[PDB]
């Protein structure tokens, strides 16, 4: 498409995985590597997505996705995933998550850093970084059609004033896109 954000999708490294319920597992924990997790939370029927990135290789080791999970279950699953990957630190989009989730991240002792996606400017920095890394052949994700489709359908639009917006085509989702961008915000 003319308005595609990820014009370098052809450079994406596609990784086999095992589907273990809500997790797509590419690689189990490598203790000699350091990891982080990009985390998008779901309000109401929206998807939550947690993307585990190996910072030593630049590859997604695990991606967990679900909808309809309770707020506490979203935090608990994130905790488990962090623990599974050596207390991997979480890059959490805390914007619009609400008091309960913010309090629970602290109360549960989660290793996390807030990165609130609170404006088009922030979103554009995150996405541009992902897109730049992707075109350089540095992004490697589970070879899953749902993931690739969401990237494929992430597009450019304009606001009434002529400002750039990035969003899903049609009435689609971008929780996977955003989780990935949050993770890759940490990758050098
Ligand atoms: Co979302």
Residue numbers in the entry: 255 to 442
Paper text:
Structures for complexes with Mn2+, Mg2+, Co2+ and Ca2+ were determined by soaking crystals of the apo protein, whereas the structure of the Zn2+ complex was obtained by co-crystallization. Only one metal ion, bound to the site A, was identified for conditions containing Mg2+, Mn2+ and Co2+. This metal ion is coordinated by the side chains of D294 and D429 and four water molecules in the canonical octahedral geometry. The nuclease was active in the presence of Mn2+, Mg2+ and Co2+ but inactive with Ni2+, Zn2+ or Ca2+, consistent with observations for T4 gp17 (41), SPP1 G2P and HCMV UL89 (18). However, G20c nuclease had minimal activity with Co2+, in contrast to the high non-specific in vitro nuclease activity observed for SPP1 G2P nuclease (comparable with Mn2+ (39)) or the absence of activity for the T4 gp17 nuclease.
